[model samples]
Target: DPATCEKEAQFVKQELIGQPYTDAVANALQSNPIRVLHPGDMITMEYIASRLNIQVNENNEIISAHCA
Candidate 1:
């Protein structure tokens, strides 16, 4: 499951995180207070999981991402 999920994530990242997007992301990540969202942004599954600090399953789906 994780294997499949990783592939999916890789594809999604490749499809989305090209030059322009990468530059935008870099700028955002460099900013103070760090923007967590952008309009019209399609969130990747891995991004969602990472934001929640979730460890995904074999299929790359979130196993149990949560916080208190």
Candidate 2:
């Protein structure tokens, strides 16, 4: 299951990287659930298990993407 999740994350990176944050979220949600991480938000092991972890700035723009 995790293998598939990671693959999905990779897929998002390849497909949506450099695109607008909104597009990335919309596209990623089409396949799997996403966890939004903010600056200073504590990242726990539970959070790491998400299929797609999207790091965002205060401006609501994407900063980076982490695949589980």
Candidate 3:
């Protein structure tokens, strides 16, 4: 589901771009639980983020640890 997450993240990022809010980015990142992903996907981070046209902060953290 890598492609799916990238696609959705791209769309969501675009929608949330240029907005000023404390948790806006976090909110955007968390909006799609399936898009953010788990820890093991680190190696693919650049590829996935690039493919999705999204960027990660220096912390390189997943938007959510668990979602439900």
Judging by TM-score against the true structure, name the best candidate: 2
Q: What tens-digit string does per-residue lDDT give for candidate 1 at 1-68?
A: 33433444444344433333334443433222222233345555543222212233344333332211
- TM-score, cand. 2 vs. native: 0.54
Candidate 1 residue 48 Cα shift, in angstroms, is 12
Give per-residue CA lDDT, model 3, range 11-51, as digits (tens). Answer: 65556444332365555543433333434455432332223
Highest lDDT among the candidates is held by which one? 2
Q: Is candidate 1 or candidate 2 better by lDDT?
A: 2
In the predicted model 2, the residue pairs found to clash are: none
Which scores better on TM-score, 1 or 3? Answer: 3
Backbone collision count in every prediction? 6, 0, 0
Show pairs that collide, candidate 1. 1-58, 1-59, 2-58, 2-59, 3-58, 5-59
Cα lDDT, model 2, residue 21? 66
Which residue pairs in candidate 3 collide? none
lDDT of each: 0.34, 0.63, 0.41
Error of 2 at 50 (Å): 5.5
